[PDB]
């Protein structure tokens, strides 16, 4: 049946090339020999033997067989290298996670400098992204590494969220020890820079807001190489972390340790004056320092900017 | 889409273990010993209750596809717990599982691990993943016992007594094939049903529908009393075969 | 890591801008000509321009303007680079010593902003109170010109109009006032604001908004006798000033877009207008004086003067002399006469200044068998199209072959003692239903001619409607003699067929040498071409014969001969064809993991592929198997303009952001993933747009005499005419020259005080990285021009790391010899 994963052989795909390099293996583009559908194969190397099957892949197999959404990438199946019939122990062959193929990634469309996004294109893009994030956040899953690299785009304008390698469940009743270094620095929330370690789904919202700004400027908003340098850049635009705008900032580990040069005032509206008002309000709410005051995913979908968007009119990005 | 993980009691007469000449009593014993091994080892390591159960469910499902005579059970158990830790985000190093297993198993038992215990366990992971068809997410009776009980209102102390007695019954059912016969939701109502009988409580009074004698039907729809009683019979059988008494 | 060296063989020749004023002395009239990164200062005389000074800047010159603030004796120069380096410059001369003073400087880049579509605009107030900059959509940046602003500090005023076409400061206002054309969904409009330095915001402008032509392109600030502004469009010219409104729409300007303007008479009575087809117009402001004594604008008139080169910028000098500054063709000095000549023209060319124009393609060929090599470049565009033959002899000797049509690709076929050149010419839909060419050109002035009769796409049934006046491209293959450079034959391709790739080679066991062209059927409706041809031609006995054609399902962007087989890239696919004994192409194998296989280069059984957005991929042909294998890919995303193979492990690429990089096989065989990862080992901001990499050298080296340390030779041509050379170094030579650059950068004074390290940093809108693996040879070659005192300062405390001389302290004369050896590679 369709559900008996781990048995079908990778022979069933004609490998077309290596589309990317992943955390646990290299990612290949392949055509299905039986149907002709183009897929993406992620190689899992269990030959490491230090801790067996990578947990980053386990998270993606566990979570993506639960999540069904237009804007969440789909894992079609899991296939294997030709195994050793005589002995099960000797076998070191690897496993491939089959995903739907996506024509491009946002970083690539932007880094190559080719794409131009209009307001409506940004609406169709953000509406899909936030709708996907809501599905995940309502299912009590955290993405934990939202980056332009991980937003896969079809030429048609469909968006799918993809790398669930750092995804974990969130419990309101139980605050749990989490890893305080999840999202890449350019898209990392301020709360985690100070090392909260017990964080909300708001970490992902901050990233998606950073993407919203980046779609209007065509340049990433907060680019730095050091955690303190990022806090300063964020502080210049969103304001310096202070007790008045973020009451519980003091309970964060590094609040005394990490400090901006000045107590900068918030200038988000001024520096983003060119952004349409309907969107600017979204950015100010998404890039709010306090995780408890930062808007939710659903609230973004019930915003003047994204609420009245029609996904049927998926106006393709200008390519 | 998703695989079917439930059999009929009658089907357990035809596990690989049975067909290789193992009798029903022996396979049942092996299942209890392997499950309790997973339980005790993980408890020594400080593991969450969900992590213990997941390892146990992997274990029970494994021996629906393989024979106990070809896969030593304590190696399988250790591997199940090892994978369960990564699935449930309570990971442990394989060497630590082996260390604890050595403490708990005598030298004959630890013989199953062979000359290289870590290797025998790590090697099995490939077969375990393929066997459980990479369907790693598992739900357990505990969450439903708590979700369903939260909707009971009445004497705080009588309901808490109901919950703990039922929770004990959930822990004991992991030693049985009930995990392979009924969805967790039915097991949760069944353990509530049994404890209510034993404590002489009438649960319907605590429900929003106090004159609905079939209180379970708001929680799990379409559950016959026969199903709920068959489960109760199987749980108490463990209490009559061993020399412990209904809690 | 990798070590490479990059030098300029020919400096940029395209004129990016030109201004005239009183810069060197309050007395002389100067013409400042800006080429990419180069500023040329001339003194205007009646006989002709006199050169006085040339400086380089560590930046692309984006804005160049002359202003004279109250209290200064002479004009000062403002320049803004494309990396947002701003500065104010002064000319100072002490007898024979000429130097350029940096009076103020700073970088005006904003952390958050959207670069505008119509590019950086810089204007200065008529009272020299402020400099206006339009860098980002929705923002106007003001640098106030006070004496104390030596760092050029500035502030932003919110601008409601996000899409601005053009802006100028207006003459004759009570306050500093800007006039600009902007676009919103309702069309284009002209609007005014007043700029308040005290309030640091805009105040309501002197006159109301007026709706203007949809393609309104340029804004002219009209001098005080009249006041107001003129707006130039595609069909109409309009004048605006409060209540006054005029419009002239002479049909002559509709034919060709007007791109440049310049004021002739300081009063504002006459302006020069130029268009893309090279026509020069006089725009006349007819005056009417009322009894009140006030001077008003009565009417506007446009008069055709003649033809010039297609000019990016125009500047009137004196008498009838106009400087025609061309980026697509040769820059010129032309005389405007009051009386027309017998042909009806008032324009008579005086001098012609060489511009290698856009170098679309080029090849190196040893025409005279002199063990040297000469460079034949496809240069220029439209009526300025030419073939330029370049040889070394101390200056470069350049011979110009005019084509009067666009040259696209060139390849040399020795067997036939001729070049094959792909060209396109513009025809316009005419009343016959066909098309008519605007002027005769190479493809029409061929001795013998032929037209493709292929029936491949003839089934059509796809409608493409034509409107009278629309332009089309007509593509040809030209057979040009290598000695006379006379067009022997021209072959015209199908209607709507674009010639994209050209090679000359023998295939298989076929002894005949063929010209092979790869084409794409281009219809305006299509996002990406879906039909194409590979055509095999034979040039024999003065006639071109069609030998074979292969239909493909896409555009044949690039082709290259591969071990007797034809390697061609059709859109995403990279294909290898065999040439059968029946003289037809037969497919052997394909590679499909590409978005757009724009560029191909080969060495041995290895193939380097350049992609529109996926950087470079190293493929290999596995002869044992008859297929392709991916050796290594560059996973860093870049948009390629040209690629070249340096050696079996190093690969050279050019980015559309004016950057260069080198990728190498990671040479670590521990994991397969390492071998599949190309590590970008070199990063370098070139500052030019490289279209063509080409192995070869222009110097006549026997190599029996001392060989320079540099090894290998790659020449490249750029959009601004710049020709450069890339070569490799040993680890020892790189470190010496690198350590020296750091020493040279501390000693040498930069114009505008621009840090050299900043200039060469890799730069996209998104990223900035320090340069790596590249020696700026133009910096190294400047050691020989710095003062002897300065030379000694550079060589202090220097030790080598070469195995022959374990550690060798340097003298100035020792390094003078090392650099002089390096200047011999070009
Ligand atoms: C590791 O994450 C993934 C990234 C992916 N990127 C792309 C875009 N490609 C388009 C084709 C090519 S040629 C060289 C690079 C590129 C990028 N397409 C995918 O299907 C995809 C799937 C993934 O995981 C399931």
Residue numbers in the entry:
A (entry chain B): 715 to 1033
B (entry chain C): 20 to 266
C (entry chain A): 1 to 393, 708 to 1140
Reported in the publication:
Recently, several unexpectedly diverse compounds were reported to deplete cyclin K by linking CDK12–cyclin K to the DDB1–CUL4–RBX1 E3 ligase. Here, to investigate how chemically dissimilar small molecules trigger cyclin K degradation, we evaluated 91 candidate degraders in structural, biophysical and cellular studies and reveal all compounds acquire glue activity via simultaneous CDK12 binding and engagement of DDB1 interfacial residues, in particular Arg928. Crystallographic dissection of 28 ternary complexes demonstrated that despite considerable diversity of the molecular glues, the overall complex architecture is highly similar. The low-affinity DDB1–CDK12 interaction primes the complex, while the ligand, through filling the kinase pocket and bridging over to DDB1, drives robust association, offering a rationale for the unusually broad chemical diversity observed.
Interestingly, multiple other, small cyclin K degraders have recently been published. Structural evaluation of HQ461 (82), Z11 (83), Z7 (84), dCeMM3 (85) and Z12 (86) revealed that all promote the formation of an analogous ternary complex, and sustain the hinge hydrogen bonds and the π–cation interaction with DDB1 Arg928 (suboptimal for Z11 and dCeMM3; for HQ461 and Z11 we observe hydrogen bonding with the side chain instead), while also displaying interactions with additional residues. DDB1–CDK12 complex formation and cyclin K degradation can thus be achieved with small, almost fragment-like compounds.
